[PDB]
Design a protein around this ligand. Structure first.
Ligand SMILES: CCc1cn(Cc2ccc(F)c(C(=O)N3CCN(CC)[C@H](CCO)C3)c2)c(=O)[nH]c1=O
Length: 349
């Protein structure tokens, strides 16, 4: 006897699909049989991070021989992969390391989803109502003719980046987000409050909606995070939407809009994993892109600057090396974040 609005019922059914998570983890080659997702613990995942840090130590020492082979073998033993007939590959590039961190990140958010969906049943409540209660996060659908829908649609469409031309986006539905406790934790005192994008894999939304956006743990290798262990946002919808990792066959995903208390940004042209130690008073890191929304179109929504598009050149160019195409924003404390809107997005490849 579900008491939820049907749109919220659809949302819960989408993000609590444990079998869809199983599929995604198999595409990342995690062995869903040898280590079932229902048999996932924080300790298993912590040991995996510690193995990745040992791998990082080998990479920074230029040790691509025995020491790296066994450090990788230890990671693959603690986090079982199914490579079928092939031999597990060595991890020595930053991207190869990053791919394994992303795998561990999905496991951590799936672990939260498993505890939630397997949590104590009722028989008095519809299952979706139980799962929704166990989120401790209000999800309120907004009317498609509403003003909020119009401005979010404009933000989504007007900040789609030109270099992301292989797909367009259609807003299927829109929910207001109010996670228990975030208002009382939020740094209302800080300036430069912006409504910014965050995209994530479908496996992670139960954890994100339940536990909020959070920092990478200390046991994670620092070089996996280009601007340090923070929470990353964009002002271009498509740059965040790329981190949904939607596909031709799985072209439905979610995008998150959050009020971000940026304060004073430490501006940077290129990546630095140690950027948090460079704050020294400032409250956020801004990686500078060559294209960004301009102030002329900025609007305001419940106290936050919505950086509506179109985007234009910023004259930013890094002579030292590589230049970011688009901005990214990083805060290092979740009390600078308040989740606001959840977009159900169709990817039209
Ligand atoms: C620029 C927009 C953008 C970037 N990136 C990539 C990225 C890179 C490094 C990062 F540290 C994080 C990040 O924020 N993390 C790390 C993982 N998790 C650790 C517990 C958390 C997840 C939220 O709880 C916090 C994200 C996305 O994935 N989506 C996006 O929209």
């Amino acid at each position: 006897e579900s008491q939820l609005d049907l749109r919220v019922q659809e949302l819960i059914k989408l993000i609590c699909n444990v079998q869809a998570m199983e599929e995604m983890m198999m595409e990342m080659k995690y062995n869903t049989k040898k280590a079932p997702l229902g048999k996932l613990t924080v300790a298993q995942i912590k040991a995996g991070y510690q193995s990745l840090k040992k791998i990082e130590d080998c990479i920074r020492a230029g040790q691509h021989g025995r020491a790296l082979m066994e450090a990788c073998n230890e990671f693959y033993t603690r986090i079982p992969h199914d490579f079928g007939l092939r031999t597990p590959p060595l991890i020595r590039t930053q991207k190869e390391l990053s791919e394994k961190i992303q795998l561990l990140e999905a496991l951590g958010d799936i672990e939260i989803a498993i505890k939630l969906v397997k949590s104590e049943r009722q028989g008095l409540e519809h299952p979706l109502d139980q799962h929704y209660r166990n989120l401790h996060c209000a999800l309120r659908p907004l009317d498609h003719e509403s003003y909020e829908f119009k401005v979010i649609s404009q933000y989504l469409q007007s900040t789609h980046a030109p270099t992301h031309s292989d797909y367009t986006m259609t807003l299927l539905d829109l929910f207001e987000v109010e996670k228990d406790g975030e208002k009382e934790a939020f740094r209302e005192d800080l300036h430069n409050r912006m409504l910014l994008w965050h995209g994530s894999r479908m496996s992670n939304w139960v954890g994100i909606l339940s536990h909020g956006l959070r920092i990478a743990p200390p046991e994670a290798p620092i070089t996996g995070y280009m601007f340090g262990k923070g929470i990353y946002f964009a002002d271009m919808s498509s740059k965040s939407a790329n981190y949904c990792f939607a596909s031709r066959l799985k072209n439905t995903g979610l995008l998150l809009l959050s009020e971000v208390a940026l304060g004073q940004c430490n501006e940077l042209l290129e990546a630095n994993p140690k950027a948090e130690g460079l704050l020294q008073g400032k409250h956020s890191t801004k990686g500078l892109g060559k294209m960004a929304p301009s102030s002329a179109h900025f609007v305001t929504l419940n106290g936050s600057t919505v950086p509506l598009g179109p985007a234009s050149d910023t004259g930013i160019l890094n002579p030292d090396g590589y230049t970011l195409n688009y901005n990214e924003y990083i805060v290092y404390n979740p009390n600078q974040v308040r989740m606001r809107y959840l977009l159900k997005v169709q990817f039209n490849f």
